[PDB]
Design an enzyme around this catalytic site. Structure first.
Site, PDB file in Angstrom:
ATOM      1  CB  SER G  95      34.801  46.219  22.074  1.00 43.61           C
ATOM      2  OG  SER G  95      34.040  45.226  21.412  1.00 43.61           O
ATOM      3  CG  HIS G 120      34.659  42.605  25.412  1.00 46.74           C
ATOM      4  ND1 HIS G 120      33.380  42.215  25.082  1.00 46.74           N
ATOM      5  CD2 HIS G 120      34.863  43.791  24.792  1.00 46.74           C
ATOM      6  CE1 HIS G 120      32.832  43.127  24.299  1.00 46.74           C
ATOM      7  NE2 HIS G 120      33.710  44.093  24.108  1.00 46.74           N
ATOM      8  CG  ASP G 171      33.819  43.841  29.775  1.00 48.95           C
ATOM      9  OD1 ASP G 171      33.593  42.920  28.962  1.00 48.95           O
ATOM     10  OD2 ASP G 171      33.039  44.799  29.952  1.00 48.95           O
TER      11      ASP G 171
END
Lengths: 190, 192, 191, 191, 191, 191, 191, 191, 193, 186
Positions: G95, G120, G171
């Site tokens: 992230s 993501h 993801d």
């Protein structure tokens, strides 16, 4: 729990406890509370009106409960005209043993493997607040303790000093020991 | 749970829940833990069935993991007191006081289903052991008396020595229907 | 709580006030007796013996009780180490606190005038769950501890074991004067 | 808890009282045996061997038990390091605490007169959930640990494995005298 | 816990006992492997390489497992830095703890005699919620991690990948001897 | 939930819809298998045998599983009573639900086209706490149940015990077609 | 956790091991990115620029992600300060951790061989409660952040914005090799 | 709370502000009276007597009350030590706080003009559960404490025991002037 | 809630129903709220009962449901397809997830929605947790993917669309008006009066 | 609560349903809305020509649940008269305005509140999921304002202004607005 329904031939459908009440059987099962004691009182009053002469059978399977609640049953048992026979199923402890011994003399029974326990009362209510409030509640508990031992000694044909010794801590008795003590009169087998 | 309603044909019709219908056939169920309330229902049914017919057998179906000793003793003394024989049958499991009440059935009429599980063991806490050491001594003595009483009654039911039950109830003793029959807890195993 | 810092004149050394009092051979047992609080007392008793095996150690007790095994670690350390352990009751010495108070060196067990001393049989030394065989074992162990405590208390107080068995049946609260008459303490301090 | 500070004369060095006792080769195991409390014992045992591989290490035990793997890290460290590890029971040595007590150097395992020593088979070394295949694995591992503990205990006590299997079936509480007769300790200290 | 303070002779320097052992090139991995505990190991491994790139680093492992990514930060640091990282199993090396144990320099992977070593496929590396598309992604990532771990384990143990796939299917507990025969460790220490 | 009331023409009799279907010899096992839900099934099976010993009983199963002993009370009742018990899988028959589905009369075990049938070894039949001796006992009892279930499943499916031991190791999900090929059901209903 | 203390030779200076590594221009981002953890990184980046504006800063990342605004404070500080900020992925960079990893100086973005890098689209930057007008505002702000992140990621990776919009939809887990091919990192370290 | 640091001129010594005021023989009792807060007061009173047995000790009280036994440890320490303990009421002195306020040296008990002083009979010194025999014992002990407190209060105030029994029946709130007229304090400070 | 009692008029006498049993007499079955084992089995029991009363007359399946269990919804689905009478479906308020599946599962030509109803289709979420070991998680992930494909395949059959269309459109929550669901193929008609 | 029995013995709500009175009391849920729908369907069959009286005392509730009532009201042949008792807020005010034009009533001290919808469901997950739920909420917001504007004979722009924040109205203000037609007194 689902209470079974049974049919009385005369047909009338009863739950099995109302059917047994028709045979003058009153159950005290579980703790003695205001609500469970008042149901016993209501049944005792009702059965006296149906027949003031026939015996009432008070089946006790109780670990104890409130003293005031048990005293409502106790005074109702002594007041109503018909004899209240008491029977110990499983256990009669604390006020349950008191109400067991409170049955009509000669008609107090226990089953062979029942357990009967007598002891001084615990808290009849909390003892908080100020020391003046705690003194009052301590005095009231001592009066209840003496009243219970005195009534127990009367039921058992024993001296008050005997009940004061024996109720100091939890006194567990078999049906035979309770019969020798004076809590019950007979032990049923068949 | 929703208990189904069934119709009994008579001389007219009567609607029963399915358990009251089976009570009409002298079938009493002990399902789940043995409590004051569940044991008193069994006692009420045993007393009621004796009055309906003192001579006909009562069928006591047991599917119970155990429960209170005093509650189970109310059933036990009622079974022995009432005139009609109380036949016992193990469905699923009869453990602890459930196995005691199973072995308590009339000798020759104690049954188990082929895949039932029967477990016998010494009692656990019949109540907490708090307070002072004097109170704990009293409750420990009472538990030992109950332990001896249960082993003695079990040995009587099984036609075994008290020493055998003291060994075998020390820890959880699980038995198949065949092992319980060989032990003396049940008399027969039903198949069809 | 913030523990105050005090300065010892010697150069200067800064202590927290409890380490400063330990320098004067004063050991505090305050609050419940736990494994950790008892081991600190043991560590201080062992340390003070090394510093001076002849000088008295002053064991100040303000405790409602606690674990028996924890209190026994203090008790055996008090009896083992060479220097006399004088005991003083501040506020209260109840249960194992009263036991450790009576465990002080005979003639050097003190209490303050308004302190409260309570003796009683032990409660649960641990739960009694499991099977009846496990409960029998824990009940027997508790009875052995009960007899051991009453026997050691009777020795401390110069009384019969039968006296301690009566008097420890339920919570027996005593003033400093009653504890002195009983045999738990030797003197009551005033000034 | 506030750990007292003590001054070592040499100049002066200020220690907390536990570091001061570590300077005297005293290692404490107090309370439950955990990964963290066991690793501190291991770190202290390793450190003391480096300071002096010949002098005895004094391992003071006041513990109700704890993790088997954590206790085994202490156990293997005690046996590995060159200096003898003397063990002393204060208050109680139960479960792995009794194991580590019996694990001391033969002839140097001590207990205080009123200490309590308890030996028993292990409980859950970890939960037994999941599938029956997982439960079978964890049950087999627990049985291997049970046999390993009884075998090492029997070696410590100079007893047969069959004796330890009987006596550890349920909680076996022993006085210091009974543990000495059993073979868990060698001597009982008084003064 | 109170970490003891020890004095190093050089003048004098006061260390906590873990910083003192780090001075001897001993790094501890105790308890679960987390981002924070793994980064401390990485920081210590990086620091020790700077102090001396040639001397061995001793990695003491007493861990039930933990995060795979956290353990991989240790793993890659062990392989990257120039000095050999010797690994020692104390108490237990399970899951990523067993992985890092087998990750030590070949010939320098040790275990104590009563240590327990457990290898198994990974559990959840993270929850699998959300939509079926998200669950498919996380399931694929877990399978890639499972294959990566088995492949690296097979390399460490000089075994076939098929052997590790069988043996890590469910919790595989091994004694120090079984782990030596398997290929997880090279030697078992006694004295 | 509010169970609808339906009227049967005969005069008229008002039923809840489940009692109306019981009149047609349809018994539902919906949701987890508990002592109470299993005893209702047993009560219905016993009642239906007496109403007509020769007519088939239709046992509709939509259950994720439940207690083994509870499911065994149903299982033995199904095999004992004279009338054939036909089983139908609606939605799902998992764990003991799949066992009771396969337990139907051979040739009369059905499933709907999009139903899901899952077979697996049992999980905990009860906790495994207490002492290692207690855990050994419960582990042995679980293994006996595991073997009994696989043996009865192999009998239902006309397969070898070794096949069921492989296939029930982990959750084995099957379509209606796969369960028919396996031997759990005999037919798949469409219209 | 206990952070070890290390001694720097110069006289001597005692550091915790993280302050010692900061002296070597190593900044750690470990665990979630919060206001407090991001501001420590910013404070360290600002401090290191003052110490030497020309020498590289080494930003070690082991983070599952965190707040976007917190990560943007690090991101803008990295781009603002004169010295190059080299980034290294340890364990994982997911992230905002992957964003800050790709944000390193081009040619100096590294990852360890078994690290895991995940990119993501952002989740909730904050709750979307209140009225539909408030929810519309927060939805628009989240979409602007989503576009800003994809645009900056595409710039870091030398890819089209359309590529990052596809690949950050769900993801996207990448090995170090896949992240190097993607453009998130420049090199993979081995020794 | 952050306790400020102040510098004492002598060289210089840095104190927290409470240790600085202890240097001026000022002891604070702030908040509830507990075993720990009372023992700090006792430790400070003992320390100040050693520093100078002749100089007054100033005991500043801002307390709503607390444990009787804890307050009695302070009370007996105040009466035992040679130096006069002057007491000052700041904000409030209620329950045992008012008792300790009245316990100051006669002629040196002070209150600030807007302070609030409240006297009352004790509440629960501990729960009254268990059996009626246990409740009788705890009720008797509470009555003895009630009489002891009223008797000591009557001595402090130069009033009859009957007056304190009336006035402590329910919460008796007093201004500084009413407490001076009552006999709890001697003077009211203004400047 | 208190379910009102209504009186059905018959020959010289009155039968009292709760309002839902009265509507069941008119062959109206309600699926309201989440689809559970218990709520789905009531629908199945009503569908089986109504087939026996009259296997020719249509059954009216009124759906106001946000979704629920797939296996529970499949028990309804297979019962709808098995029984002889056509099961007409009507969307009231909303038909989401398995509710939209059962709505599209109605007899072709008899799938209805009210004008302001909301119909939402999407891939399934967790059919159950994915804990345990990676081998257990792999199994549950494979089972969820099989369910996902089965649902998309049956949806594509209901809607006369390609499987690839349903795979795109069920990737994330796809909300549709009654008109969009009619154009999609989930419903056949929109009722007004 | 104990629902009184009135004289066949009815509970008082079934007795009022016999008079074609349907109550919506409290929050609008799937279960409470389906009971209203069941009663509306039942009453149309008992008499398709006679008016149905829909008594509303509701703070609001689910939009989809309220839409099941709304579409049932518009579908069935008999006019559905609506009466506001105590309050008609959010979907309660929507269903109040949804009554047959000329037969929408309120009691003199009733409170009617109109506002844009809140969360029709949580907005978690990924930004793509949040975008979808935000778009669906905006479509519902426009649909509600459009239907409200139709009920009130007002422009859509008026309802967009007035439903921005909680707009409380007396019975007189709701009559002037166009939510109700008459105010009952005796």
């Amino acid at each position: 729990y689902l209470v079974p329904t049974v049919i009385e031939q005369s047909e009338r459908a009863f739950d099995i406890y109302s059917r047994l009440l028709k045979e003058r059987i009153v159950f005290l099962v579980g703790p003695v509370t205001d609500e469970s004691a008042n149901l016993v009182v209501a049944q005792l009053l009702f059965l006296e009106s149906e027949n003031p002469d026939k015996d009432i059978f008070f089946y006790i399977n109780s670990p104890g409960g409130s003293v005031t609640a048990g005293m409502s049953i106790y005074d109702t048992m002594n007041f109503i005209k018909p004899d209240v026979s008491t029977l110990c199923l499983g256990q009669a402890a604390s006020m349950g043993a008191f109400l067991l011994s409170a049955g009509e003399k000669g008609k107090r029974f226990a089953l062979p493997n029942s357990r009967i326990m007598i002891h001084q009362p615990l808290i009849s209510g909390g003892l908080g607040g100020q020391a003046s409030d705690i003194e009052i509640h301590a005095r009231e508990l001592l009066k209840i303790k003496e009243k219970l031992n005195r009534l127990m000694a009367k039921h058992c044909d024993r001296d008050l000093a005997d009940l004061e010794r024996d109720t100091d801590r939890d006194n567990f008795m078999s049906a035979e020991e309770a019969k020798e003590y004076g809590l019950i009169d007979q032990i049923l087998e068949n």
